[PDB]
């Protein structure tokens, strides 16, 4: 179907991890799967 939410989400999250000058908020590295599950557990 025609959805545009997670395309927002991914969007957001995309737009998230890249930069910038914002005095504080630096882009974050993305984990996933093996390290993440454990990361979730902690």
């Amino acid at each position: 179907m025609d959805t545009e939410g997670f395309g927002e989400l991914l969007q957001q999250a995309e737009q998230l991890a890249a930069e910038t000058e914002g005095i504080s908020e630096l882009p974050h590295v993305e984990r996933n799967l093996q390290e993440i599950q454990q990361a979730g557990e902690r």
């Binding site: 737009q15 910038t20 914002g22 005095i23």
Partner: protein, 203 residues
């Protein structure tokens, strides 16, 4: 009232006990009243209306769709202004600070200046060669950059292959994350309200 007005007193030549019962039988009375239907052409009738109806639904749905496209188009390439504004902000902050600073060297010596100043100055000293020196810089930044690249070289190949993969099956797991996203957004806004219902606990 007007409903009440037509539905009773009966219609087209429809029997009064049946017409009654469609009224009781009616599944959904505000949205609906009993309307007499008359054999096949009448169903034909209904269908003609349905189609009539269909086109207009489709269209209005298109109108919502166009307005949403306009909002998204405005929004998606409008990020530009927000980002631009933010950078301009930081540059103006630098100039603000630089002008703020020069108003404290030119009017201010005067050669008065000290007191509080040294404390500023103690903080600044600390932070500055902290940084320097030694330690940090060197070692760390580029064991990391020395390093990163070697991992880049190596990762490429191991790659090679493996062998496709599994991309593919990626569509959804689209979908299920959407639903986790809304749940988290509700919890975050509830925590934020919690502590509201909390500074007020400032009691």
């Amino acid at each position: 009232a007007q409903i009440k007005q037509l539905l009773q007193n009966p219609p087209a030549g429809v029997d009064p006990i049946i017409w009654e019962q469609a009224k009781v039988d009616n599944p959904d009375s505000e949205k609906l009243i009993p309307v007499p239907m008359v054999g096949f052409k009448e169903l034909l009738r209904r269908l003609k209306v349905q189609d009539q109806m269909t086109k207009q639904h489709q269209t209005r749905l298109d109108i919502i769709s166009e307005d949403i496209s306009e909002l998204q188009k405005n929004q998606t390439t409008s990020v530009a202004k927000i980002a631009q504004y933010k950078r301009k902000l930081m540059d103006l902050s630098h100039r603000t600070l630089q002008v703020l600073i020069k108003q404290e060297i030119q009017r201010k010596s005067g050669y008065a200046i000290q007191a509080d100043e040294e404390q500023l100055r103690v903080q600044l000293d600390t932070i500055q060669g902290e940084l320097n020196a030694p330690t940090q810089f060197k070692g760390r930044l580029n064991e990391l950059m020395s390093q990163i690249r070697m991992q880049n070289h190596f990762g490429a190949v191991r790659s090679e292959e493996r062998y496709y993969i599994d991309a593919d099956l990626l569509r959804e797991i689209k979908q299920h994350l959407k639903q986790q996203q809304e749940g988290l957004s509700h919890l975050i806004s509830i925590i934020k309200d919690d502590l509201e219902d909390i500074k007020l606990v400032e009691h």
